[PDB]
Design a protein around this nucleic acid. Structure first.
Lengths: 203, 141, 244, 173, 191, 107
RNA sequence: GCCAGAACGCGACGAUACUACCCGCACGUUGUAGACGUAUAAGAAUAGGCUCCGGCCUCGUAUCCUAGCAGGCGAUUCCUCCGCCGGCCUCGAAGUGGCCGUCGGUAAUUCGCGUAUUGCAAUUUAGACACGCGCGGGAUCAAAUCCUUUGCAGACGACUUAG
RNA sequence: GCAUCGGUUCUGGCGGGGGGAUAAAGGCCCAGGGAAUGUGGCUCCUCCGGGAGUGUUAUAGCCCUGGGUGUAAUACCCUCG
């Protein structure tokens, strides 16, 4: 338990409801959250059942005027995740409104938030919660078929980003190699007793 | 007929294995009661590694790479103790990677406030030497 | 209780908002799909409607009742004086749609276009692109030639700004019209160089279209002030003896 | 619950036409020595004409396991009530104490047949003496020669209040 | 009731090679290469002896143990297919209207495409496109025989089914109108 | 020279009041302590004092900063939350704000 | 494909007088759902992986930074670490980082002077964002509405035009 | 604000006593009897890991009955500080 300034959650491999509940507690506490890669969340069950649940959602609409009041059905993966979170917050009060202002959700990895450290919530990871043998789906596929347009744009944009992040990895490996080899050559030069003193204290 | 398979390999639950409980205790398996529970005993002179006789659920143990060779199942505390000392289980486990890392854990927690000051200053002195060496190799490239 | 005799619906719900158009000039909402193996070419034009008249021709339709006989058909005449390219714009792709990021105008502009950026042109100083021209003839158009490279590097579609010569028509208006035309060229380098060549030089419609081919027409319909239900949707009238 | 095995001894009140009545002994599993006596009277009212208002309780003792660190196989004969009749059952278990077998049996019956504690009678419990008299296959597999088996895909344990881990866990422990 | 150990084995002839990695099987022999992705099944592969493949499942249920024998025959088919190929035959059956077939090899797309004309005296022309790796031929030993062959059994059989399913009769008795293209024998290329 | 920090307290957050499901009691407040999980750890901070500091608009005696004082009374639940009583109930708009927890009454 | 375009969704461009715009610090009314080390960039699998190929290693209880009147003045002693500027490359998803140079600061070792009195506790007033002001330097000299007119428009406003 | 008290109350640690089969088990020793998911030997098939049969402690061991140092220790319940 700690209080950071802003924490960045990587959405790939998490469960929709089991992540919204964790995140919705943090917002009301006073934390700031940023969810990235919502195109790659997960839902338990089988894909066809997710369709049926969503089609039953698309049927609700105000009768006398479909341009006011009626449930507006957003189609993007971030907006699906955002709807889940808004369910778990008293969003009709000033306290709830303020809490929602502390959240940001995107597709892909926008410019400000790449080159940062992405956390992981192990109380909602799929490979840890679900039982081997059952089936699951992906919000990305679900949203594409209910009428989301920008799958291929975000697909190829992500490909470019991960290509840039390969030369960077080689620099890190080079930097580590130099630090490790320097330690082996410098430890023996001049260190009569400091070494044993540190080793006894546990370092 | 060359075959190259790259798969996983776990450690088995058998008679002779030594489990590591949560409170730094060791025990040796004597008979497998069920899928989730086994019967085990660890006789040891060191009062940190010794454990009573009883049932232990497998969801609260860790499989260590030590295994007593040819331990008859259902043995008694006396016979298991003889095999324990003859193989030297406690001696073998001392140098294992898990032990060393565990040993460091208590030492760090024991640093007194004055000791924290000294280690911090001592670290700086070693750091200074390391910083010089890195610059030399980095500039040379 | 249910409706006694069934009947279809009066009017269509597809064209639902029956309000005055937001702008007087028609709006092309989609251009034909791009194909990178053709040669560079424009994909639209614009003109003025003159009137209608009648023609006579012979039909060639094997199997019809009027095959190889004379028919009478109505036609319409559109008056199309040439257009003048003024600049080009480039769009890139984003996870929220397309967006433009650069424009590069030509060195000299006409009074016709300059009159479009003003609402009271008579009592004005007419300083529309005065300082922009100084970008030309300064460090040899360095600022101009960098934006073009940017379009070459980042952009994925290119469009051309063009305007009409309304002084060559019998109209009383003097303010020209301006719009955009997309190029379906074959490569981004090709379709930006072709656009550059056409700066401040007229292009005729016979280079755009060709005879006996099929086109689409966009415009704004005729206006009626404020009408009742019987004429607007087309419902039956009530009997002669109805009060109120 | 948490059970234990009691021996309960009871008797009919002596009378002038019959002094020194007979003594009846039963073995009862119960959480404490209050429900122990109640179960005794309930089982006795169905076999012989004795109440509690006209009887008395001679003794109540606790039976403890003789070798609670040895593994052994058990067989249980029982009867229970369904929603539409009564039936007989026979099941087998593998553990180290008789009391636990009754603990395991109660949980298993309540899970697989929706049979509460109210409607179950324990006819007999006996530990299988040899190995060749085991019948059910879900235990025959557990007494095979040279048994050994890995444990794949076991989740590691993480503090329920350490949110926001910093790297991907691994299930190869 | 969950079984504690279910194991199966697969023998490999010393004419080819096989490599498994992240449940991606690759078999290569004197006739090409084949791949499959078994990531949807939780199985442990291992090498028992110098020429025997082993696969096992631990603490599986009834619905889960069923899938072991399925995997075995899938991998066996790959091994036998690469070393002996597969070959299906199909026959024409008609009463009055003869059936005409054309087989032309597509160039720059590799695969073949068949053409069926005059089916039950029909005026339409129906086209089917085979899968990559299968080769279609017209027999020369018997009359009115088609011969399909290839390396991957799944593709070969699925391509044959496409031809059979395209030729159907509608709004008639299928007990009397017995027209259509059908399969007559399945086997291997070698031996 | 001496670029280190100056902190002699532990930072906590003000979560809510003490409430049923539909009634609140502004007398006592609940606070989240940094670093404590079990209720055994929370036993350390009973009796200490806590401060809530905030900015105002006007200035009274050479300052624009006000303070409200309180102390920790007992633990709460199994997760390490504690109860606290202040000389004035907290402003009920400070849900999610940060407070300072001293170490004054020691051992 | 087609229709409307959030009147509190967004982008590119043209001309911008009046202190409305740009640059430097100088204070200080006044604002904030709430600084006090606000320090940590690979991707991918979970019935398999990482690597400085030794073959080594797999639970952030980690790594980096952390002393000096809230951090003074000098000395022995070492070329480490930090910062404002300037020049070249590079960066378009909502444009960012790198290299080089001048300058300023700097316990890895060891010392010499000063701290008191805030009196036995009382936020440690001190961080970054906007906004209003004052100087002293640079650039620049626009439009819109009413009014008259047209009828591709029209209940009146509004709209397409002309002066 | 601190120290010494009175009333109510929540929460940690330590020293004893009693009971049951005077716990049951358990370690060491003595006496007797059994088997198998049969140790070491012996025989048989394979050099390819090993497998099959005989046979009651040997180069491993286990189960059943009685006794000893035992007024043993510990678990559970109750109780004095």
């Amino acid at each position: 338990s700690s209080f950071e300034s802003v924490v960045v959650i990587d959405g790939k491999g998490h469960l929709l409801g089991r992540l919204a509940s964790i995140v919705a507690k943090q917002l009301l506490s006073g934390q700031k959250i940023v969810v990235v890669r919502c195109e790659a969340l997960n839902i338990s069950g089988e894909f066809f059942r997710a369709k049926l649940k969503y089609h039953a959602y698309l049927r609700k609409m105000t009768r006398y005027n479909p341009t006011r009041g009626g449930p507006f059905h957003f189609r993007a993966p971030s907006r699906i995740f955002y709807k889940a979170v808004r369910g778990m917050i008293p969003h009709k009060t000033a306290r709830g409104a303020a809490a929602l202002e502390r959240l940001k959700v995107f597709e892909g990895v926008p410019p400000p938030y790449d080159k940062k450290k992405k956390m992981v919530v192990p109380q909602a990871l799929r490979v840890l919660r679900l039982q081997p043998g059952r089936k699951y789906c992906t919000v990305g596929r679900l949203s594409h078929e209910v009428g989301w347009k920008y799958q291929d744009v975000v697909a190829r944009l992500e490909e470019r980003r991960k290509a840039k992040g390969a030369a960077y990895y080689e620099r890190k490996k080079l930097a580590a190699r130099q630090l490790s080899e320097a330690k082996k050559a410098a430890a023996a030069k001049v260190d009569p007793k400091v070494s044993e003193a540190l080793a006894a204290y546990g370092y | 007929a060359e075959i190259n398979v790259e798969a996983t390999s776990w450690r088995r639950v058998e008679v002779g294995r030594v489990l590591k409980l949560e409170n730094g205790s060791l025990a040796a398996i004597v008979e497998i009661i069920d899928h989730k529970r086994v019967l085990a005993d660890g006789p040891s002179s060191d009062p940190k590694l010794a454990t009573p006789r009883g049932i232990v659920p497998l969801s609260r143990a860790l499989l260590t790479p030590i295994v007593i060779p040819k331990l008859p199942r259902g043995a008694r505390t006396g016979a298991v103790k003889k095999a324990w000392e003859a193989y030297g289980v406690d001696a073998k486990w001392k140098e294992t990677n898990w032990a060393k890392k565990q040993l460091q854990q208590e030492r760090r927690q024991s640093l007194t406030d004055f000791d924290r000051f000294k280690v911090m200053r001592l670290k700086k002195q070693r750091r200074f030497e390391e910083r010089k060496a890195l610059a030399k190799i980095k500039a040379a490239a | 209780s249910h409706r006694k005799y069934e009947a279809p619906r009066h009017g269509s719900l597809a064209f639902l908002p029956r309000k005055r158009a937001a702008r007087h000039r028609g709006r092309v909402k989609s251009f034909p799909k791009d194909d990178p193996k053709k040669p560079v070419h424009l994909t639209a034009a614009m003109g003025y409607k003159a009137g209608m008249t009648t023609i006579v021709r012979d039909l060639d339709r094997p199997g019809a009742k009027a095959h190889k006989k004379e028919v009478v058909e109505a036609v319409t005449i559109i008056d199309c004086p040439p257009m003048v390219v003024v600049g080009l714009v480039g769009y890139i792709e984003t996870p929220r749609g397309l967006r433009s990021l650069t424009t590069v105008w030509a060195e000299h502009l006409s009074d016709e276009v300059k009159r479009r950026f003003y609402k009271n042109w008579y009592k004005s100083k007419k300083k529309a692109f005065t300082k922009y021209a100084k970008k030309y003839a300064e460090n040899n158009g360095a600022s101009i030639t960098r934006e073009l490279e940017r379009i070459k590097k980042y952009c994925t579609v290119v469009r051309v700004l063009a305007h009409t010569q309304i002084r060559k028509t019998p109209l009383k208006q003097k303010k020209a019209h301006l719009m955009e035309i997309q190029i379906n060229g074959g490569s981004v380098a090709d379709k930006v160089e072709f656009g550059r060549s056409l700066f401040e030089k007229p292009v005729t419609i016979d280079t755009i279209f060709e005879k006996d081919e099929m086109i689409d027409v966009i415009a704004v319909t005729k206006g009626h002030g404020f009408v009742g239900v019987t004429a607007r949707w087309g419902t039956k009238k009530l009997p002669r003896k109805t009060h109120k | 619950g948490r059970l234990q095995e009691y021996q309960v001894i009871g008797r009919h009140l002596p009378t002038e036409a019959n002094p020194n009545p007979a003594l009846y002994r039963m073995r009862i599993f119960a959480p404490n020595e209050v429900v122990a006596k109640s179960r005794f009277w309930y089982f006795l009212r169905g076999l012989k004409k004795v109440k509690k208002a006209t009887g008395e309780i001679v003794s109540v003792n606790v039976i403890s396991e003789k070798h609670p660190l040895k593994v052994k196989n058990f067989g249980i004969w029982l009867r229970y009530d369904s929603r539409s009749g009564t039936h007989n059952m026979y099941k087998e278990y593998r553990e180290t104490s008789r009391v636990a077998a009754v603990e395991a049996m109660y949980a298993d019956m309540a899970a697989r047949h929706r049979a509460r504690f109210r409607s179950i009678h324990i006819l007999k419990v006996v530990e299988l003496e040899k190995t060749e008299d085991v019948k059910r296959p879900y235990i025959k597999q557990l007494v095979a020669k040279n048994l050994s088996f890995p444990l794949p895909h076991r989740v590691p344990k993480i503090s329920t209040k350490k949110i926001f881990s910093a790297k991907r866990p691994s299930t190869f422990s | 009731m969950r079984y504690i150990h279910s194991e199966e084995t697969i023998p490999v002839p010393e004419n080819l090679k096989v490599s498994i990695k992240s449940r991606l099987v690759t078999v290569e022999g004197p006739r090409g290469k084949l791949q499959k992705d078994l990531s949807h099944i939780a199985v442990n592969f291992s090498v028992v002896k110098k020429g025997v493949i082993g696969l096992e499942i631990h603490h599986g249920s009834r619905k889960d143990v069923a899938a072991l024998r399925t995997v075995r025959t899938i991998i066996n088919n790959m091994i036998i297919g690469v070393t002996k190929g597969f070959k299906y035959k199909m026959r024409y059956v008609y009463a009055h209207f003869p059936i005409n077939v054309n087989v032309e090899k597509n160039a720059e797309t590799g695969c073949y495409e068949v053409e069926i004309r005059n089916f039950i005296g029909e005026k339409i022309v129906r086209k089917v496109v085979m899968a990559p790796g299968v080769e279609v031929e017209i027999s020369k030993a018997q009359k009115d025989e088609l011969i399909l062959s290839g390396n991957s059994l799944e593709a070969v059989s699925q391509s044959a089914a496409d031809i059979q399913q395209i030729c159907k009769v509608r709004n008639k008795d299928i007990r009397k109108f017995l027209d259509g293209i059908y399969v007559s024998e399945k086997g291997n290329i070698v031996e | 020279p001496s670029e280190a920090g100056h902190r002699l307290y532990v930072k906590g957050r003000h979560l809510s009041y003490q409430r049923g499901r539909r009634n609140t009691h502004p007398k006592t407040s609940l606070i989240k302590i940094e670093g404590v999980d079990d209720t055994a750890a929370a036993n350390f901070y009973l009796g200490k004092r806590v401060a809530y500091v905030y900015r105002a608009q006007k200035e009274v005696r050479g300052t624009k900063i006000r303070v409200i004082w309180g102390k920790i009374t007992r633990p709460h639940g199994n997760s390490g939350v504690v109860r606290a009583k202040f000389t004035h109930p907290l402003p009920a708009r400070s849900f999610g704000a940060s407070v300072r927890i001293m170490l004054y009454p020691s051992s």
